[PDB]
């Protein structure tokens, strides 16, 4: 066993009844003085390194050609001047195993952390040396972390796409279904997770040109997509991951759910395609009143009204659907469907739950389209227009397929540096650059939506780490007050940066004029309610930083009205799974699953303590499963009120609790304004 492995395992060997957390630090030293420094490839100077990486097809030469070598040297020197040290063994291990650039045979390390950060910063700046240094300082301080696609692939010749998630709308036609399968394979080839809205597809037993009971429903398309994602599995490196979203009022909703039952037959079971359910407020109202609900056949509704079932408001059209004899429907028990959802989430963690009305009551771009589904991580909530892929030799009507670039603020590092504004603006600029340089030649709706919406996702990580390292319980009202203030600041500065980009470029996102940003409605709660901290401890935490007031929000509203906004969507809180290790941060705004996690790598086992875990903050690092899910819902709703897109909200459940407890948590989330629920992980 390696020396650093033994040093890391020495953490759990208690001394005087206490964990040896400091041993972890020793491990990193070993991991660098025995493996990383020996396995790294050193050159005489930076010129030889850059030339070797360029000619050997490791780096794209275009982004490096925008800078003179003196500027690149200055950027690299700025990166190395911080003398960044990984405080935990797992941070360095995760970076050098998942994100550091290696040779073709993967026998040596070509990229250090500073080298990777410098390359990403130079790609972000697009020829601006000062901007590149700003990005270097932002990432080496670990205030901002680009998503895994962006951080791993920026400036690389053998790179994939920098966009993490893609959302596709599938129209009710064989041509559209085949095009959706093709685009899903193309985007999984690019490495991104693909989500498909199957609510427009007509249910099982519908007519294909006057011959009835002919359609296979959404389950056949689900099987096709599952095989497509199995085939396109990132060249066999990462399993192809897809998501299917169906409205709960679709007739196939049961069969949909039956794809995830552990007793499902092979002709129905789907195993590589995640499932999500979109629940309008009408379904929750029907379940609450115990009135029997009706699921609908989408094609009959489309024939009668000319629009898809998910294209209009069910809260106002459900009674018209039920009373219409030309609309076909089936009777269901909404409470039984809710119990089935809870049982399925207990068994397998599926489906994702999207509260459609919670998303669309604060959605700023309802004029473009209502949000009808979410992404594979159930945090992207954007307007999408379905595409009409016609026959060959016929022009296709290209719609809008959602796609946003992810980037997370490290809350602990951002607040320690007292740089919410600067970090938010620089992250917005980096995400705007990632969107601008993204061009996908096989997904036309994705390309058009990227060019028009200009949507980005700016997330946050290390919420629980910051709260526990500052002596604040994650479930406490003080923690929710901190989240309210911090994310109001993040939203304020993201809107300010979006408006500044719109002013400097003279262009807004497409159809911005009909948005609530243009009409000023979006700023209502910000121009009437003060989001400054209500607790003295939180206010002290925010000292040295100008917390925006109602007057600052009014000025920002006027600025947006004058100049517009460059981005249709700005903030989305992704799960941030593996890149949180490198940043020494807790995953996303979720509470920690465990204080010390035991992970098996190779034939060895490693223990990763939570960042900053110690004796004095052991009980502030409360495990998520031990927490009240209602207070976690309260925290997520408090954050969500300042996030325009959704938050990947994983439910952390105990084995003792029943499906009724899961249903109660889901209904409280819906009541509190939670937009989406990601996972039901049971301990």
């Amino acid at each position: 066993v390696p020396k650093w492995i033994q040093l890391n395992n020495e953490i759990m060997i208690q001394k005087d009844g206490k964990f040896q957390f400091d041993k972890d630090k020793e491990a990193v030293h070993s991991y660098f003085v025995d493996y990383i420094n020996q396995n790294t490839v050193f050159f005489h100077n930076l010129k030889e390194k850059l030339d070797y990486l360029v000619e050997n097809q490791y780096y794209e030469e275009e982004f490096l050609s925008l800078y003179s070598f003196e500027d690149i040297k200055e950027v690299f020197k700025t990166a190395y001047a911080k003398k960044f040290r990984f405080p935990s063994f797992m941070s360095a291990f995760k970076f050098y195993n998942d994100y550091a650039l290696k040779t073709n045979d993967k026998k040596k390390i070509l990229e250090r952390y500073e080298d990777r950060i410098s390359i990403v910063a130079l790609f972000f700046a697009n020829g601006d040396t000062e901007k590149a240094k700003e990005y270097v300082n932002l990432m080496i301080n670990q205030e901002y972390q680009p998503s895994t696609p962006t951080f791993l692939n920026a400036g690389r010749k053998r790179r994939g796409e920098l966009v993490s998630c893609f959302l596709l709308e599938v129209n009710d036609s064989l041509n559209d279904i085949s095009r959706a399968i093709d685009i899903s394979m193309q985007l999984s080839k690019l490495g991104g997770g693909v989500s498909l809205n199957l609510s427009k597809l007509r249910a099982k037993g519908e007519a294909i040109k006057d011959v009835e009971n002919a359609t296979k429903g959404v389950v056949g398309v689900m099987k096709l997509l599952d095989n497509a994602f199995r085939y396109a599995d990132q060249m066999g490196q990462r399993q192809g991951s897809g998501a299917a979203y169906l409205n709960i009022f679709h007739r196939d909703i049961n069969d949909f759910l039956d794809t995830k039952k552990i007793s499902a037959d092979e002709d129905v079971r789907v195993k590589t395609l995640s499932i999500g359910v979109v629940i309008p407020d009408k379904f929750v109202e029907l379940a609450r009143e115990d009135k029997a609900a009706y699921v609908f056949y989408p094609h009959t509704i489309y024939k009668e009204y000319g629009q898809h079932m998910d294209e209009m408001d069910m809260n106002e059209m459900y009674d018209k659907f039920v009373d219409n004899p030309r609309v076909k429907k089936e009777k269901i028990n909404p409470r039984k469907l809710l119990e089935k959802l809870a049982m399925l989430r207990s068994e397998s963690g599926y489906p994702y739950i999207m509260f459609q009305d919670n998303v669309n009551k604060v959605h700023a771009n309802n004029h473009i389209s209502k949000v009808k589904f979410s992404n594979l991580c159930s945090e992207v909530l954007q307007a999408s227009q379905v595409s009409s892929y016609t026959d060959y030799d016929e022009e296709d009507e290209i719609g809008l397929d959602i796609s946003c670039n992810l980037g997370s603020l490290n809350i602990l590092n951002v607040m320690e540096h007292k740089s919410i504004e600067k970090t938010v603006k620089l992250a917005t600029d980096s995400l705007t650059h990632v969107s601008e340089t993204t061009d996908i030649r096989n997904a036309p709706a994705v390309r058009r939506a990227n060019k028009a919406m200009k949507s980005i996702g700016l997330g946050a990580m290390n919420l629980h780490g910051y709260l526990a390292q500052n002596g604040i319980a994650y479930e406490s009202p003080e923690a929710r007050d901190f989240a309210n203030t911090f994310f109001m600041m993040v939203n304020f500065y993201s809107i300010q940066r979006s408006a500044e980009i719109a002013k400097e470029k003279g262009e807004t996102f497409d159809q911005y004029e009909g948005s609530t940003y243009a009409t000023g409605e979006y700023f209502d709660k910000y121009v009437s309610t003060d989001f400054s901290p209500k607790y003295e401890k939180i206010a002290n935490l925010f000292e040295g930083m100008h917390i925006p007031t109602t007057e600052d929000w009014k000025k920002l509203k006027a600025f947006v009205a004058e100049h517009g906004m460059y981005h249709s969507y700005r903030l989305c809180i992704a799960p941030t799974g593996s890149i949180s290790y490198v940043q020494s941060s807790t995953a996303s705004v979720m509470p920690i699953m465990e204080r010390i996690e035991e992970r098996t790598y190779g034939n060895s086992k490693t223990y990763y303590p939570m960042p900053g875990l110690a004796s004095n903050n052991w009980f502030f690092y409360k495990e998520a499963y031990d927490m009240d899910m209602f207070k976690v819902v309260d925290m997520i709703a408090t954050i969500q009120q300042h996030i325009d897109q959704g938050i990947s909200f994983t439910l952390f459940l105990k084995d003792t609790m029943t499906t009724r407890d899961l249903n109660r948590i889901d209904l409280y989330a819906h009541h509190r304004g939670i937009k989406t629920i990601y996972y039901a992980r049971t301990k």
Partner: protein
């Protein structure tokens, strides 16, 4: 929750010895050294002798004491596979590779062998100790059965899998792989029946049954190490066989719902190449806060 599913998997795995032609093994058998041929013969006889105990006693005795028509049917099917399929398959392999006199001598040797006898009699002893209407004694026998199916066979399976992974003795290796696939499911199934009994016990009784299982595993494991050196030192494989025993011991424990006992180890690549939450209805007022 599980018997009909195992019924399905068992019956769909049905096979017969006649399906695999064995004669083409003589084309690689003739090229093995004396030590290789000796080890193979001894391993094969070991597996044969242990599997006979399972067919004549192990499966039928468990089928006798387990309550439930569907469980008795699955257990009967497994007993049938031991006696009608596996036993004939082992005999067929022997008759193909060795002349009658050599077979008789190998079985005489393995019948007298101290390490084979120790484990065979330990297992049989627990089957003979089952008492009518005593679920504790039944559980102990089920543990013994799982240890045979999921652990004790594997010091033996190693060698045919080792050849099979190299392109040698492919016909008999295919047969052994089918047998092994049956024993795997037998071990998992009997394991679930043991966990059912275990879960009906008090906390003190559970701790006592865990101690029994670990103590038994330890006795069998220490004898397996000796058995292994006795057979495999002459062909230089004992180190790797020991890793395979521990890996399979961990699988046997997991079948019984217990934690792994041994640290994770990688296995010889040649051998590798050869190889509900409680539903509670919504009561209303859960929609109001």
């Amino acid at each position: 929750d599980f018997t009909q599913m195992f019924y399905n998997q068992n019956v769909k795995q049905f096979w017969l010895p006649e399906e695999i032609a064995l004669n083409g093994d003589l084309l690689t058998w003739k090229y093995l050294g004396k030590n290789e041929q000796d080890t193979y013969m001894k391993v094969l006889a070991g597996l044969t002798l242990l599997d006979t105990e399972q067919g004549n006693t192990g499966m039928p005795i468990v089928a006798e004491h387990v309550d439930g028509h569907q469980r008795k049917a699955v257990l009967n099917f497994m007993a049938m596979m031991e006696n009608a399929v596996h036993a004939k398959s082992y005999s067929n392999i022997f008759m193909t590779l060795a002349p009658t006199e050599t077979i008789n001598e190998v079985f005489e040797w393995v019948k007298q062998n101290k390490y084979l006898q120790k484990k065979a009699q330990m297992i049989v002893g627990l089957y003979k100790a089952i008492q009518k209407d005593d679920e504790i004694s039944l559980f102990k026998a089920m543990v013994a059965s799982v240890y045979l199916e999921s652990f004790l066979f594997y010091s033996g399976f190693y060698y045919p899998l080792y050849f099979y992974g190299q392109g040698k003795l492919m016909q008999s290796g295919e047969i052994i792989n089918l047998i092994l696939r049956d024993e795997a499911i037998h071990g998992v199934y009997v394991g679930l029946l043991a966990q059912e009994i275990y879960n009906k016990q008090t906390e003190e009784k559970k701790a006592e049954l865990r101690e029994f299982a670990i103590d038994l595993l330890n006795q069998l494991y220490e004898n397996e190490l000796e058995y292994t050196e006795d057979l495999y030192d002459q062909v230089g494989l004992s180190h790797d066989v020991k890793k395979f025993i521990r890996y399979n011991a961990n699988k046997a424990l997991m079948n019984l719902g217990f934690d792994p006992y041994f640290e994770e180890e990688d296995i010889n690549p040649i051998v590798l190449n050869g190889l509900k939450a409680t539903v509670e209805p919504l009561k209303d007022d859960d929609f109001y806060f």
